């Protein structure tokens, strides 16, 4: 995918000096899935502004109006 890749956080035990992560809400989890779908659409479809419009929406923009 185009971005870093969506990773749902898990934390890590301390040595002191651990990482604390909260409980996963289903709303956080579905947001992680839809973010990954967005970054996969960007990789597959392209990321020029005309490619974004054509891949994320049904729209064929003229080239002339997008410089």
């Amino acid at each position: 995918q185009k971005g870093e890749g969506v990773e749902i956080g898990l934390g890590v035990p301390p040595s002191e000096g651990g990482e604390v992560v909260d409980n996963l809400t289903i709303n956080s989890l579905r947001q992680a899935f839809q973010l990954q779908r967005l970054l996969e659409r960007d990789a597959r479809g392209g990321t020029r502004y005309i490619e974004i419009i054509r891949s994320h929406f049904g729209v064929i923009s003229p080239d002339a109006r997008v410089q």
């Binding site: 990789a43 597959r44 479809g45 392209g46 990321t47 020029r48 891949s55």
Partner: peptide
Amino acid sequence: ARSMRGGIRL
């Protein structure tokens, strides 16, 4: 001539 993967390159 359609929408190619990886964005447009002719």
